[PDB]
């Protein structure tokens, strides 16, 4: 192989600065990095070239409108998802208690009736409730596929209950059956489903809204007991009609309230939570997702997400409590991960989620691999297309209400880079606090880029050095080039008119470098380059 590539390739060892007529920049520590490498970097942006220039320190900023529009869409999605908040998982139904190591969920008959009353809301509001701009799952309603993004249908898992053995003499009077021998719950004689009694619309659903909360969906079997509780006979006018529907659908195999010799009813409800993996099939659109927060480890550890990889633009708000996740990939994919709930201290005050100040050194060790990215306490698994060298993964966190930090991660090159956003004057005013928050986060990238897209579609391009806090911002306003240089609080340089063409800006360690093309006395033929 070395024989073949040495015959094929020709190496020039004679001392020449330029051969392919660039504008050369041999000043930076005596290195001949000037434009003979930077033209290859700026023409087609190689990932290995960028990663291996990061070890020298060169951050060549990108002024392309595709990159600026991608950064604008990323920061808009992150801003919206960070702005609106949601509670924890089991407020409506769940949060079971661990009593004698069996995970009892509901303790009394009216609580069991209220659980089935909450489960009967899938007939009313469908299998996916809607807020003003978000599709929401019902609590403790499991959905297993959600292929609804492609052909508009979902699939339901198993939420079955234990059956019942035979009774001796059965007569029904006033919708309350009077037994002669009370039948018994059998762990054999296989289980009876509830979702065959709820008629759930699952083949024609509406996804006009593109923000979705992922379900709390483990498959479970409800073990249950039976006590006396002789105080309820007029409760039948409630959401007990679902229990009567299960009774009538399975004749002789389930009876929720009877009169053998005393009154009887369901008292407890013990789930099982067998393993469930949810195979979400995506589509062409720009769907956003929010991962739910589950506060019980025995339910949290039985879940897995298996997103597909059709050619869209997807985001996923990672929760503080981790869920196993698998990502399928393809050629064209833009995956966004919001780590705002990961980089903040998370507390539950009144059932919602309130975020703390920050977490020290939570992103100091970012384990980037070809098929697995580990950030904080979460492991993200990538599969399908793990050999593409032209695909990036973005990590978004809101350092403030205006300035966002976007981490650009490529899996196969094992590299990460930092970008910023927000208003230019606000960023210059709060640059010290922004670099303080980044140092609290623990990132070690010395140069931070800055791409902004303000209102009325004017773009800003920037480069902030963390050491000594120097900034260069170049932007085009009123069809002219403005160039600003800041020593972190003062405008140390300002060219309101900057007559130049093909302007490229990069830094080496703290040395800003601006290159381009100048015309002598506005003559097109008198073209002089400059660095």
């Amino acid at each position, epitope marked *: 192989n070395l024989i073949s590539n040495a015959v094929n390739d020709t190496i020039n060892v004679l001392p020449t600065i330029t051969e392919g007529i660039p504008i050369v920049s041999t000043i930076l520590d005596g290195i001949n990095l000037g434009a003979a490498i930077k033209e290859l970097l700026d023409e087609h942006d190689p990932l290995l070239k960028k990663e291996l220039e990061a070890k020298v320190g060169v951050l060549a900023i990108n002024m392309s409108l595709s990159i600026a529009a991608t950064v604008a869409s990323i920061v808009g999605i992150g801003a919206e998802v960070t702005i609106f908040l949601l509670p924890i998982a089991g407020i409506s139904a769940g949060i079971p208690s661990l009593v004698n190591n069996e995970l009892i969920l509901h303790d009394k008959a009216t609580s069991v009736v209220n659980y089935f009353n909450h489960l009967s809301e899938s007939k009313k509001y469908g299998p996916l409730k809607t807020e003003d701009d978000k599709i929401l799952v019902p609590i403790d309603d499991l959905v297993i596929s959600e292929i609804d993004f492609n052909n508009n249908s979902i699939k339901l898992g198993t939420c079955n209950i234990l059956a019942m053995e035979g009774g001796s003499g059965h007569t029904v009077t006033g919708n309350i059956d009077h037994f002669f021998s009370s039948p018994s719950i059998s762990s054999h004689i296989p289980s009876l489903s509830i979702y*065959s*009694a709820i*008629g759930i619309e699952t083949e024609n659903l509406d996804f006009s809204k593109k923000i979705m909360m992922l379900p709390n969906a483990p498959s479970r079997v409800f073990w249950w007991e039976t006590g006396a509780v002789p105080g309820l006979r*007029s409760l039948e006018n409630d959401g007990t009609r679902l229990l009567d*529907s299960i009774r009538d659908l399975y004749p002789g195999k389930f009876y929720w309230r009877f009169y053998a010799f005393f009154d009887y009813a369901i008292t407890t409800l013990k789930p099982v939570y067998e393993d469930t993996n949810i195979k979400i099939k995506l589509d062409k659109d720009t769907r956003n997702f929010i991962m739910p927060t589950i506060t019980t480890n025995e339910i949290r550890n039985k879940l897995s997400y298996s997103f597909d990889g059709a050619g869209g633009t997807y985001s996923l708000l990672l929760s503080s409590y981790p869920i196993s996740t698998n990502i399928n990939l393809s050629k064209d994919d833009l995956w966004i991960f919001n780590i705002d709930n990961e980089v903040r201290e998370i507390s539950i005050e009144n059932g919602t989620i309130k975020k703390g100040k920050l977490i020290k050194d939570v992103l100091s060790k970012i384990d980037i691999n070809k098929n697995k990215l580990i950030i904080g306490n979460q492991t993200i698994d990538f599969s399908g297309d793990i050999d593409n060298k032209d695909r990036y993964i973005f990590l978004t966190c809101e350092l403030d209400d205006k300035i966002s930090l976007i981490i650009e991660i490529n899996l196969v090159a094992k590299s990460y880079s930092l970008l910023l956003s927000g208003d230019k004057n606000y960023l210059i005013s709060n640059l010290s606090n922004i670099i303080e928050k980044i140092n609290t986060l623990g990132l070690d990238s010395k140069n931070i880029a800055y791409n902004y897209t303000d209102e009325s579609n004017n773009k800003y391009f920037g480069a902030i050095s963390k050491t000594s806090q120097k900034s260069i911002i170049h932007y085009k306003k009123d069809s002219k080039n403005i160039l600003e240089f800041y020593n972190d609080s003062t405008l140390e340089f300002n060219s309101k008119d900057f007559i130049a063409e093909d302007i490229n800006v990069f830094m080496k360690d703290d040395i800003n470098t601006i290159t381009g093309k100048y015309y002598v006395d506005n003559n097109t033929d008198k073209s002089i380059d400059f660095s």
Partner: antibody, heavy 123, light 108 residues
Framework: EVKLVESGGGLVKPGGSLKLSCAASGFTFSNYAMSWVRQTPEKRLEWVAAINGNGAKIYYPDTVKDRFTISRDNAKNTLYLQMSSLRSEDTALYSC????????????????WGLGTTLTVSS | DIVMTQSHKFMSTSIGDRVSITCKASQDVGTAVAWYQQKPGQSPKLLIYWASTRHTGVPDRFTGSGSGTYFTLSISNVQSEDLADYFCQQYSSYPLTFGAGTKLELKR
């Protein structure tokens, strides 16, 4: 989106027979219980019959047993009502309604109503 | 089997008043009573279900109350579009019985 169109209008001799229909679209069928109602002008509304989701159990009052029947076809999203022995008391606006059933067929309110089929019987 | 009687066949009111239509059942039904509103030449629209809560899209003026054999439907502010029929019907038993009728008319 949800519509309930019905086409069974006409005039028949007393003692004869007639068949109604009720199409449905917008929502998936065989998930919701259906029923027929009889809006008389002079008297109040009269529920006449009802069926469950899979067409298992059918409920009638005393004046309807061995007189009327409901057959449901889930493939073509139709709901029928075959009539017999119209003794000059069935002149009412027949409407098609959707119940909030689960599986069994149990007394409920109605989500949507049909527009109405004006059926009258006379000499 | 079960019968259900409504109070007033005809009543009138002015815009800005409050109207309480009362429905009475022969026996106990236990909050299983629904309320409708039939426009002339149009299908009826459900307003109140389980005798206490309102349907999706029903305006906040329609408040229902009652448990047992006495059910009242109340409108906080009568408008021009709130002038139609009003029906009560129990659903605690298989022979469903509807109300007689109550037309809300305008006082001119």
């Amino acid at each position: 989106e949800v519509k309930l169109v019905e086409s069974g209008g006409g005039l028949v001799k007393p003692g004869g027979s007639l068949k109604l229909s009720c199409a449905a679209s917008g929502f998936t069928f065989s998930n919701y219980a259906m029923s027929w109602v009889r809006q008389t002008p002079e008297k109040r509304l009269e529920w006449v019959a009802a069926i469950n989701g899979n067409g298992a159990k059918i409920y009638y009052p005393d004046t309807v047993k061995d007189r009327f029947t409901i057959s449901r076809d889930n493939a073509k999203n139709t709901l029928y009502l075959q009539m017999s022995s119209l003794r000059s008391e069935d002149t009412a606006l027949y409407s098609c309604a959707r119940q909030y059933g689960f599986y069994a067929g149990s007394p409920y309110y109605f989500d949507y109503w049909g527009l109405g089929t004006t059926l009258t019987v006379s000499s | 089997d079960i019968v259900m009687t409504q109070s007033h066949k005809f009543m009138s009111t002015s815009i800005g008043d409050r109207v309480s239509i009362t429905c009475k059942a022969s026996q106990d039904v236990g909050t299983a009573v629904a309320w409708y509103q039939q426009k002339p030449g149009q299908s009826p629209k459900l307003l109140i279900y389980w005798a206490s809560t309102r349907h999706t899209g029903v305006p906040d003026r329609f408040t229902g109350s009652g448990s047992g054999t006495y059910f009242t439907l109340s409108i906080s502010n009568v408008q021009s579009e709130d002038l139609a029929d009003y029906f009560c019907q129990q659903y605690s038993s298989y022979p469903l019985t509807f109300g007689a009728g109550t037309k809300l008319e305008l006082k001119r």
